[PDB]
Design a protein around this ligand. Sequence first.
Ligand SMILES: Nc1ncnc2c1ncn2[C@@H]1O[C@H](COP(=O)(O)OP(=O)(O)O)[C@@H](O)[C@H]1O
Lengths: 57, 107, 60, 412
Amino acid sequence: LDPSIFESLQKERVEAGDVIYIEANSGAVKRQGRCDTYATEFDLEAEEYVPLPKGDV
Amino acid sequence: KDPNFVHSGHGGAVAGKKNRTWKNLKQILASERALPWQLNDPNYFSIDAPPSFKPAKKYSDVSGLLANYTDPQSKLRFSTIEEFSYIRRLPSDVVTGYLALRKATSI
Amino acid sequence: ETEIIEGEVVEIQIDRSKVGKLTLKTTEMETIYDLGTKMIESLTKDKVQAGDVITIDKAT
Amino acid sequence: PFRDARAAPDPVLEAGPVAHGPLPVPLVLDNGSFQVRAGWACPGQDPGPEPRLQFRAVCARGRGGARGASGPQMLRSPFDRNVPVNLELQELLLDYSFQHLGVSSQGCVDHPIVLTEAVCNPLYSRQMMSELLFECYGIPKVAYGIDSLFSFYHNKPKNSMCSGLIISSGYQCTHVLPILEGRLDAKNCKRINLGGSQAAGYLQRLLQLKYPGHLAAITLSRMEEILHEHSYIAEDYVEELHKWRCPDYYENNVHKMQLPFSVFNLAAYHQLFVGTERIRAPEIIFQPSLIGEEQAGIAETLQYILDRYPKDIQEMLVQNVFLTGGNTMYPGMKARMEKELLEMRPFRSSFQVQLASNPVLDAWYGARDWALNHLDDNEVWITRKEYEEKGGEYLKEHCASNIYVPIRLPKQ
Ligand SMILES: Nc1ncnc2c1ncn2[C@@H]1O[C@H](COP(=O)(O)OP(=O)(O)O)[C@@H](O)[C@H]1O
């Protein structure tokens, strides 16, 4: 990634274990929730957890 | 006929009060950690797999289905309303019995 | 579709990051939950007390 | 409905089945923790004709004190976590094996032997196993190798140099073994402190808590049947248990295990309904956190060793993932392993998973085929006189054997 995309990931509050969509042309970046493998980190926490994508990387 | 009868004294507890056949594995290993090993050397006490990085999933005790919930008094974990009705009718013995499968506080 | 919590709060605990814990009840079951940081901010902001009946939008 | 196991077969032979050519036909001895497997090398026949003595590695001696017994029949066994650590309970296990196979007569066993040992074996343990063998039984020459690697040697496409991961799972351990150019890379090999014993122990304790009314009806030898015949490993556990959640699937798939009879008698002579339990017992090696135990499990460990190599030799050694031993017998094991492997590889890359031709016997057949080839390679074996100058903590670095290191043990 270039530092412009990194600024955008930082703005979306992305961290490791999140599930992400990058579009390489636009420089569009979207957070889609935390990956459900970490859904047991706490019993109650404010995040929304999604399953690991079944499609192509 | 038989291979031999004048069998050697390898190490059994003939000479003292000490443990009967031979040292347990932990005691053997305590005597192997004394040796002049070096940093590249294979071993029996450094092949152990590492602890997991991910947090553990929480399955129910009494059925194995995924458990959203844990009971504040018995400290068992359960999936549905009928399972919560079920656990409250168990005696202390099987309750501590289930917790002991997970080395929980129960001792 | 939405993941929603609804119940009477029976106990709520906090410490001096922070980690706390709460217990909830319905007519039919009970639970205790460990709280992550963002829920501790939300629950401490809204001054929740034992005996209150509350609903939580889990995702938000 | 449950069966009961067989006992006390009739293995008796003449003083030595010596074939044409070289007279010192070796004994092939898989010194397993669950069971021992033993027999004559029987050279010159392509199919191994008779792996005799299939028997449980357990011995009886009770409140009577004065006698002990060794064949398939309170109990004891010579191992601690897949390393042998007992004196006479090893002797009377060897004795049984030799006597039922036949022996010459004089004050030694005249034949050389190939013997399985632990993936790493503590030096004191190897020393004792050599002493208890050369001193008492007087063997002329000895070879030590690893069960799993013999089973790989048997299952290879060719008798040639190879690389792979071996996935192995016996009574009280599972190991992940990376091998390169025929050599075990034992510097970064790893094992998990769980195995099929612990699965049966967990399934026992579950059903005891499910039916306290008849603790006595359920016992290890009956847990064996449900774990061998009626249990399977999930492709993805949190999805399997989710389809097990609905009653219309449950009733069609739950297993009805009828106890023997003397209310329709099930209030004591129950049908022991096993549902979710038939998944939760196999899964222990992939998620040891179903017990108390905090270790990586067969999924995270494989990734954790596979990321410690250059990216080219990863793609080399993953070309031969091999499944062998005990627990790999479960139905669905190949599918779960290859799915779990697909997530932890580069997006378009290739891998292959091979399952051993006979997961439980291929360790012995491997040791057979190995010894039957390397008869006269006298750099491979430990000769009787070498043990008099090297103290027993010594080994000869052939393929399918633990990595040697220069070291010595003080003794007087
Ligand atoms: N058909 C089978 N299905 C499932 N598990 C099996 C089967 N046969 C054997 N096992 C398991 O295999 C284990 C023993 O394997 P083995 O290779 O003999 O161990 P080791 O080499 O450590 O003695 C036992 O725990 C047993 O439960």
